[PDB]
Amino acid sequence: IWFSFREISYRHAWIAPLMILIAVYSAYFTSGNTTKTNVLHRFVAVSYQIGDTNAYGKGINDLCFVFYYMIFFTFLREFLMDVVIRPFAIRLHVTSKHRIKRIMEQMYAIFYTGVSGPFGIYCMYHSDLWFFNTKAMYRTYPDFTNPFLFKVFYLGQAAFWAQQACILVLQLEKPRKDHNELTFHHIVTLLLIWSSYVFHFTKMGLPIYITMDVSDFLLSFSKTLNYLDSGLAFFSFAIFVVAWIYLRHYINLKILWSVLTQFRTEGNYVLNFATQQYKCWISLPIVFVLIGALQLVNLYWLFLIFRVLYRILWR
Amino acid sequence: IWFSFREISYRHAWIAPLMILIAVYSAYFTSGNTTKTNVLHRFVAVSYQIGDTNAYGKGINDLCFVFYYMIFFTFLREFLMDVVIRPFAIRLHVTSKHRIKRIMEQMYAIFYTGVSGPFGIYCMYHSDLWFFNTKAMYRTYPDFTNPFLFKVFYLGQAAFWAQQACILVLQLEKPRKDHNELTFHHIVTLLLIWSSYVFHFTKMGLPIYITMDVSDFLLSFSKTLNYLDSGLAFFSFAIFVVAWIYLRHYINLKILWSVLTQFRTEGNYVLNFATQQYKCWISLPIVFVLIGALQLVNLYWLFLIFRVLYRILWR
Amino acid sequence: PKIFNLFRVCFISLLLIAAVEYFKYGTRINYEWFHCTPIKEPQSGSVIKLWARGGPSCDKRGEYKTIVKRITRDYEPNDEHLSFCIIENDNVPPVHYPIHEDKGEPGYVAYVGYDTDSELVQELCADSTIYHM
Amino acid sequence: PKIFNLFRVCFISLLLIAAVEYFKYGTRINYEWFHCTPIKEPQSGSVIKLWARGGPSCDKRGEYKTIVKRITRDYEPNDEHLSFCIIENDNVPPVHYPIHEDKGEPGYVAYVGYDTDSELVQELCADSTIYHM
Ligand SMILES: CCCC[C@@H](C)[C@@H](OC(=O)C[C@@H](CC(=O)O)C(=O)O)[C@H](C[C@@H](C)C[C@H](O)CCCC[C@@H](O)C[C@H](O)[C@H](C)N)OC(=O)C[C@@H](CC(=O)O)C(=O)O
Ligand SMILES: CCCC[C@@H](C)[C@@H](OC(=O)C[C@@H](CC(=O)O)C(=O)O)[C@H](C[C@@H](C)C[C@H](O)CCCC[C@@H](O)C[C@H](O)[C@H](C)N)OC(=O)C[C@@H](CC(=O)O)C(=O)O
């Protein structure tokens, strides 16, 4: 039956990750201690809850969590992609190869991105950061402790983008298309997530993808309605372009400016290795450079957006 | 004239190393301070003379000395090889290719080996090690300080064998012949010299090449008289075989046994990282393993010697 | 003339040379991690008693080094300020430990605690000077 | 499916993760090499005076750590036995240094010397306990 199981794993792509994670979950949820005294708990949940409150520390169990949810997010992508997005590519009349491949990719982008957008907005809502407050970013800097939703948001993003980057370097098929911009995006996103979490620049991390996720939701919606020829596509693309101009430019420029000005002015700005607070004049370069890298990528992308916009406007 | 200089450096092989070392020596010996306050002095002489006595410390100037004398020993080999050993290969009737190549190699071996044999014996003579005294090896172990002749003997051996090993890995010509035994010999010799000097097992190091050098002198003399057909070759080979059996087996077996017994019994045997004395039960394995490696190589070599001996005896 | 093979071999040889020299230097400067093992003796609320025991290479400064590093990186003063006292055994030669396990009185004992209970450190440290931190 | 390219990329990513975590840990445990710079004040034959000066991250234990490491690895007791005294400035709060260069009195001063001149250490260290080594 091993050969038949391999055959079904060749006709699908989610059977093996599904088995791995269902085995882990079933073994963990077999009665016992569903608490911090279990290896499967370090692999299934965020650990290091300080005392009995809404504060969470860091550790190696964080890496265990991240890798287990890479394993999980492979299963989410394969299952959704095939089982759902091929029926939505066939039950609606679409006739091409690149058209159907990219229509699957864009609707999966719509799915995960519209899941991660509102969750980021909610996480920023019940916090002192509400509507991108640039002073709560630096008020209480060292932030060794993160809330439950906020920590799980950070580690889910890490698992998702790490899985993207590893299937980017394990070339199964589809050799080369956009992979220069794509690899720059994946490497920069993964480095920013890791370095933002490790070095406690964490409340700084929430507002920046909030923008990336909701803007990507709008962009992928516009491209999906392009594929599925509807005539409402240009309306969605205009909404997308105004939302892109607002979020990815105005909010990130405000955040950069926030770095430059209120990184010094607000909170603690005397380096102290004992206290483990790195917010000083040595890390301001690094933070500004990472934000600048993201902004350069988004600048090239709106050059592309507006090039397409005017060509279609007079075409 | 640069092209003509390259042409003369192609018709010879010692012009460039000769220029390098003659420039270094001339610059150093231009009037001034021929003392420890000069970089060329760290490149021309043994440094770290403790006080004003016959004791010498260690340092990086040791590596500078070793590499400069690798540069020098390239010049000694090329100059002697060509300028002397080709006339002694032609002015005496010899008619072959392998015959003349190996006759040059064996007579150069005779030269450097009969230079390094008596110097090692002299160094062991005016010391408390006289005729392989296995207790002066361990009496005063930590030996941070070595005499002048003894230190220069150790660093000349290091430079010579390092130059051999680097022209072994920079294949100019003569691709492959005996290079398995040769590379094992070169790597083991260089590791033993370096680890013997660095870890203060230095008076342990003198007796072991003394044996290698004088035995190699006898062996190369026998092979040279083989080449230059004389009829006295078998007498020299019998003298060689008895000297090999005495030195490389009896003396090294005595030295190994010395390790095993008097490494503990004699001197200091309590590990102390502060005092920087490594003579303990943790280094006895390492020392015995290196001596055993040398002895295994010499065991294979007398198997070869006796195989040749009996075949020639009944041939 | 395959130069690069040479270059990599020589560059890794120099790397072993540097690695072993760092081995020697590091094991010399902070040898007390090798020879001395620090003993923690629990006490009342927040104080403990320090000392070390090793072979003859755990001399008095090995004990002082290991005691002060235990004191200084087992207690975070930014959270709460601590207070300690170090008392020396004045009749035991500096190098005083036997190879075997009947070693006896250490060279140094130190009492260290937080400032919730500083009178407890006053009690345990009889009349020796008391260092604040 | 070029697995090995993945494997090397992930193995170097984990290597950066471990390297940066060691960076954080190391710079935390022995931060006094970053914030505190030890001042040696020469004296008569073999004694010196120790202290440290840095920013507000050079607290009292930064000074104690750097002073004791200077004392313990600037003096070899196997050659000759030393003797030192540490005196604390009892009216200066633990965290007491200004960012600027008008810093003032340190938290700790220590006198250390060899046993050729131990009465000199007796003189410089007034009535504080005197540690042998
Ligand atoms: C009325 C609605 C019609 C849609 C219309 C505007 C469409 O432009 C055209 O109308 C089609 C013709 C125009 C023409 O000539 O007529 C052309 O644009 O190609 C649009 C333009 C595009 C250049 C914008 C960038 O793409 C987006 C990539 C940004 C970063 C994102 O990825 C984030 C990140 O990575 C991660 C997910 N968070 O989208 C495409 O065109 C894409 C191409 C794909 C391709 O070719 O690569 C395609 O359409 O599928
Ligand atoms: C009456 C005098 C005639 C000389 C005669 C005994 C000669 O044996 C023959 O009479 C010739 C026929 C015998 C036959 O069949 O009639 C055969 O021995 O080959 C002899 C035997 C040889 C097998 C011994 C090892 O070699 C030495 C290498 C040991 C380690 C040394 O290197 C140290 C280290 O590296 C470094 C330098 N410190 O020497 C050779 O033969 C060598 C070969 C070379 C070759 O072939 O590799 C040759 O002669 O030039």
Side-chain angles (χ1 to χ4, degrees), chain A residues 1 4-5 8-9 12-315, chain B residues 1 4-5 8-9 12-315, chain C, chain D:
Chain A
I1 196 166
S4 76
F5 205 77
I8 209 67
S9 177
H12 294 268
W14 46 285
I15 301 299
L18 177 59
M19 294 298 102
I20 292 173
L21 63 89
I22 199 167
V24 170
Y25 289 152
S26 176
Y28 165 95
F29 275 98
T30 49
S31 311
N33 51 317
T34 187
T35 69
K36 190 171 171 61
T37 62
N38 192 354
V39 291
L40 301 185
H41 171 281
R42 93 188 70 249
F43 284 96
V44 69
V46 290
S47 297
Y48 308 108
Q49 172 158 19
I50 284 177
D52 201 358
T53 183
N54 216 8
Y56 287 73
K58 304 170 185 198
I60 305 299
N61 301 317
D62 284 17
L63 276 169
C64 313
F65 183 89
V66 167
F67 279 52
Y68 178 75
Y69 274 108
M70 293 177 70
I71 297 302
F72 168 76
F73 272 108
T74 294
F75 154 66
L76 183 63
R77 179 212 268 271
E78 305 305 330
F79 172 74
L80 274 296
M81 185 64 72
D82 304 300
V83 170
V84 160
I85 314 191
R86 218 158 296 170
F88 289 98
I90 308 302
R91 275 69 174 174
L92 276 298
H93 41 82
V94 176
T95 317
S96 186
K97 291 158 258 206
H98 292 171
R99 227 262 259 283
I100 192 168
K101 180 165 71 176
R102 291 173 180 171
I103 205 167
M104 293 183 286
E105 288 189 354
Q106 295 319 303
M107 293 183 286
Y108 182 69
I110 285 183
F111 172 70
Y112 65 88
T113 301
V115 175
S116 70
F119 188 63
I121 290 164
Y122 178 60
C123 292
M124 194 186 69
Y125 173 72
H126 53 61
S127 294
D128 62 358
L129 291 163
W130 184 224
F131 267 118
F132 310 129
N133 191 356
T134 61
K135 284 190 201 183
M137 294 176 70
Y138 320 105
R139 255 207 289 278
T140 65
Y141 161 55
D143 280 331
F144 310 108
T145 71
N146 308 296
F148 174 63
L149 295 175
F150 183 76
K151 182 170 173 180
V152 68
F153 178 82
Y154 239 91
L155 302 181
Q157 294 292 108
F160 181 86
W161 291 105
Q163 188 274 331
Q164 298 290 99
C166 65
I167 62 170
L168 184 65
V169 65
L170 192 152
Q171 295 292 322
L172 292 148
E173 278 185 353
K174 58 186 73 175
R176 172 72 181 52
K177 271 276 135 10
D178 194 75
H179 291 284
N180 295 114
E181 322 189 286
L182 195 68
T183 189
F184 195 46
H185 176 76
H186 279 116
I187 301 299
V188 172
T189 290
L190 203 60
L191 293 161
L192 269 68
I193 280 168
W194 158 72
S195 57
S196 67
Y197 186 75
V198 164
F199 282 111
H200 316 298
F201 282 103
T202 307
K203 291 174 71 175
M204 203 162 77
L206 206 76
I208 292 167
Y209 1 103
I210 288 162
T211 68
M212 311 273 135
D213 290 289
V214 62
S215 177
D216 270 324
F217 171 83
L218 288 147
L219 175 142
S220 287
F221 182 76
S222 71
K223 287 203 285 188
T224 300
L225 285 188
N226 179 15
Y227 288 158
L228 291 87
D229 186 77
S230 65
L232 183 63
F234 188 79
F235 179 49
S236 67
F237 185 58
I239 277 175
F240 152 73
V241 73
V242 306
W244 180 285
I245 295 296
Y246 171 54
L247 297 179
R248 281 177 180 255
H249 285 71
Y250 175 55
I251 299 302
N252 283 22
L253 258 61
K254 183 176 74 174
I255 282 174
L256 261 102
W257 180 245
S258 174
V259 169
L260 282 163
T261 68
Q262 323 186 342
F263 189 77
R264 300 92 57 86
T265 318
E266 197 76 30
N268 220 337
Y269 197 65
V270 165
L271 177 52
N272 192 359
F273 276 121
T275 287
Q276 200 178 6
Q277 77 97 31
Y278 314 107
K279 177 175 177 288
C280 52
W281 64 263
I282 315 184
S283 66
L284 190 149
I286 300 169
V287 170
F288 186 83
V289 163
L290 300 184
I291 308 307
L294 268 187
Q295 191 64 1
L296 305 183
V297 185
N298 297 298
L299 287 178
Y300 192 72
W301 290 7
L302 75 165
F303 292 149
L304 281 175
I305 301 299
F306 275 89
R307 121 197 257 144
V308 161
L309 183 62
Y310 75 75
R311 306 204 291 208
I312 290 176
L313 186 58
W314 57 262
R315 189 261 292 167
Chain B
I1 196 166
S4 76
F5 205 77
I8 209 67
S9 177
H12 294 268
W14 46 286
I15 301 299
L18 177 59
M19 294 298 102
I20 292 173
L21 63 89
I22 198 166
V24 170
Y25 289 152
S26 176
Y28 165 95
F29 275 98
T30 49
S31 311
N33 51 317
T34 187
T35 69
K36 190 171 171 61
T37 62
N38 192 354
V39 291
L40 301 185
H41 171 281
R42 93 188 70 249
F43 284 96
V44 69
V46 290
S47 297
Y48 308 108
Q49 172 158 19
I50 284 177
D52 201 358
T53 183
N54 216 8
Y56 287 73
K58 304 170 185 198
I60 305 299
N61 301 317
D62 284 17
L63 276 169
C64 313
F65 183 89
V66 167
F67 279 52
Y68 178 75
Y69 274 108
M70 293 177 70
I71 297 302
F72 168 76
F73 272 108
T74 294
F75 154 66
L76 183 63
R77 179 212 268 271
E78 305 305 330
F79 172 74
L80 274 296
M81 185 64 72
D82 304 300
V83 170
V84 160
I85 314 191
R86 218 158 295 170
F88 289 98
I90 307 302
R91 275 69 174 174
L92 276 298
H93 41 82
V94 176
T95 317
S96 186
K97 291 158 258 206
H98 292 171
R99 227 262 259 283
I100 192 168
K101 180 165 71 176
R102 291 173 180 171
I103 205 167
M104 293 183 286
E105 288 189 354
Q106 295 320 303
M107 293 183 286
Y108 182 69
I110 285 183
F111 172 70
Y112 65 88
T113 301
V115 175
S116 70
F119 188 63
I121 290 164
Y122 178 60
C123 292
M124 194 186 69
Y125 173 72
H126 53 61
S127 294
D128 62 358
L129 291 163
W130 184 224
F131 267 118
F132 310 129
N133 191 356
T134 61
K135 284 190 201 183
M137 294 176 70
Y138 320 105
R139 255 207 289 278
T140 65
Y141 161 56
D143 280 331
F144 310 108
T145 71
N146 308 296
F148 174 63
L149 295 175
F150 183 76
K151 182 170 173 180
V152 68
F153 178 82
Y154 239 91
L155 302 181
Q157 294 292 108
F160 181 86
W161 291 105
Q163 188 274 331
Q164 298 290 99
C166 65
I167 62 170
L168 184 65
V169 65
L170 192 152
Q171 295 292 322
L172 293 147
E173 278 185 353
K174 58 186 73 175
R176 172 72 181 52
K177 271 276 135 10
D178 194 75
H179 291 284
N180 295 114
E181 322 189 286
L182 195 68
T183 189
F184 195 46
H185 176 76
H186 279 116
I187 301 299
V188 172
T189 290
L190 203 60
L191 293 161
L192 269 68
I193 280 168
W194 158 72
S195 57
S196 67
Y197 186 75
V198 164
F199 282 111
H200 316 298
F201 282 103
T202 307
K203 291 174 71 175
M204 203 162 77
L206 206 76
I208 292 167
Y209 1 103
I210 288 162
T211 68
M212 311 273 135
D213 290 289
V214 62
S215 177
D216 270 324
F217 171 83
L218 288 147
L219 175 142
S220 287
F221 182 76
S222 71
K223 287 203 286 188
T224 300
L225 285 188
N226 179 15
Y227 288 158
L228 291 87
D229 185 77
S230 65
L232 183 63
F234 188 79
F235 179 49
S236 67
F237 185 58
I239 277 175
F240 152 73
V241 73
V242 306
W244 180 285
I245 295 296
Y246 172 54
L247 297 179
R248 281 178 180 255
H249 285 71
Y250 175 55
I251 299 302
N252 283 21
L253 258 61
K254 183 176 74 174
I255 283 174
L256 261 102
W257 180 245
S258 174
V259 169
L260 282 163
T261 68
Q262 323 186 342
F263 189 77
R264 300 92 57 86
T265 318
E266 197 77 30
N268 220 337
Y269 197 65
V270 165
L271 177 52
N272 192 359
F273 276 121
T275 287
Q276 199 178 6
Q277 77 97 30
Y278 314 107
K279 177 175 177 288
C280 52
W281 64 263
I282 315 184
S283 66
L284 191 149
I286 300 169
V287 170
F288 186 83
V289 163
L290 300 184
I291 308 307
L294 268 187
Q295 191 64 1
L296 305 183
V297 185
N298 297 297
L299 287 178
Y300 192 72
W301 290 7
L302 75 165
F303 292 149
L304 281 175
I305 301 299
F306 275 89
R307 120 197 257 144
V308 161
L309 183 62
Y310 75 75
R311 306 204 291 208
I312 290 176
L313 186 57
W314 57 262
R315 189 261 292 167
Chain C
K2 37 183 163 287
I3 289 190
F4 190 79
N5 201 340
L6 183 148
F7 178 77
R8 73 178 181 179
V9 167
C10 79
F11 190 73
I12 195 66
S13 72
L14 277 296
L15 192 62
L16 282 71
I17 291 172
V20 73
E21 294 294 328
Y22 180 68
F23 171 78
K24 290 169 66 179
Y25 178 67
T27 56
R28 197 187 74 232
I29 55 169
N30 64 7
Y31 69 93
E32 72 273 5
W33 189 86
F34 297 105
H35 305 306
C36 301
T37 62
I39 290 178
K40 303 285 183 66
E41 187 191 290
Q43 285 254 313
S44 296
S46 173
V47 300
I48 57 173
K49 184 176 180 179
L50 277 296
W51 62 99
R53 67 182 295 276
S57 301
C58 197
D59 48 354
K60 265 178 177 186
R61 66 189 263 255
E63 314 177 36
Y64 205 75
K65 280 187 173 181
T66 185
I67 281 171
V68 304
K69 66 182 181 180
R70 285 300 97 204
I71 283 187
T72 57
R73 63 171 78 154
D74 282 357
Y75 278 79
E76 182 65 26
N78 303 288
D79 307 334
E80 202 191 329
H81 278 312
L82 72 164
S83 170
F84 69 99
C85 165
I86 297 169
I87 298 142
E88 181 208 52
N89 189 359
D90 56 353
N91 63 6
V92 65
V95 176
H96 57 277
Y97 273 136
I99 286 294
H100 45 276
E101 293 83 3
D102 176 43
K103 293 181 173 66
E105 294 293 328
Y108 286 97
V109 292
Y111 297 93
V112 61
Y114 277 115
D115 275 309
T116 62
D117 66 34
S118 195
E119 69 275 16
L120 182 55
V121 165
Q122 295 298 110
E123 292 322 309
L124 277 296
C125 172
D127 60 355
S128 181
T129 187
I130 298 167
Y131 300 108
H132 291 297
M133 184 180 288
Chain D
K2 37 183 163 287
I3 289 190
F4 190 79
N5 201 340
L6 183 148
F7 178 77
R8 73 178 181 179
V9 167
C10 79
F11 190 73
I12 194 66
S13 72
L14 277 296
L15 192 62
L16 282 71
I17 291 172
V20 73
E21 294 294 328
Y22 180 68
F23 171 78
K24 290 169 66 179
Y25 178 67
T27 56
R28 197 187 74 232
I29 55 169
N30 64 7
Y31 69 94
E32 72 273 5
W33 189 86
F34 297 105
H35 305 306
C36 301
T37 62
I39 290 178
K40 303 285 183 66
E41 187 191 290
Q43 285 254 314
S44 296
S46 173
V47 300
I48 57 173
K49 184 176 180 179
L50 277 296
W51 62 99
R53 67 182 295 276
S57 301
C58 197
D59 48 354
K60 265 178 177 186
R61 66 189 263 255
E63 314 177 36
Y64 205 75
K65 280 187 173 181
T66 185
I67 281 171
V68 304
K69 66 182 181 180
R70 285 300 97 204
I71 283 187
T72 57
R73 63 171 78 154
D74 282 357
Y75 278 79
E76 182 65 26
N78 303 288
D79 307 334
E80 202 191 329
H81 277 312
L82 72 164
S83 170
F84 69 99
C85 165
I86 297 169
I87 298 142
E88 181 208 52
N89 189 359
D90 56 353
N91 63 6
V92 65
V95 176
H96 57 277
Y97 273 135
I99 286 294
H100 45 276
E101 293 83 3
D102 176 43
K103 293 181 173 66
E105 294 293 328
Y108 286 97
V109 292
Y111 297 93
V112 61
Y114 277 115
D115 275 309
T116 62
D117 66 34
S118 195
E119 69 275 16
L120 182 55
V121 165
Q122 295 298 110
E123 292 322 309
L124 277 296
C125 172
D127 60 355
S128 181
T129 187
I130 298 167
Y131 300 108
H132 291 297
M133 184 180 288

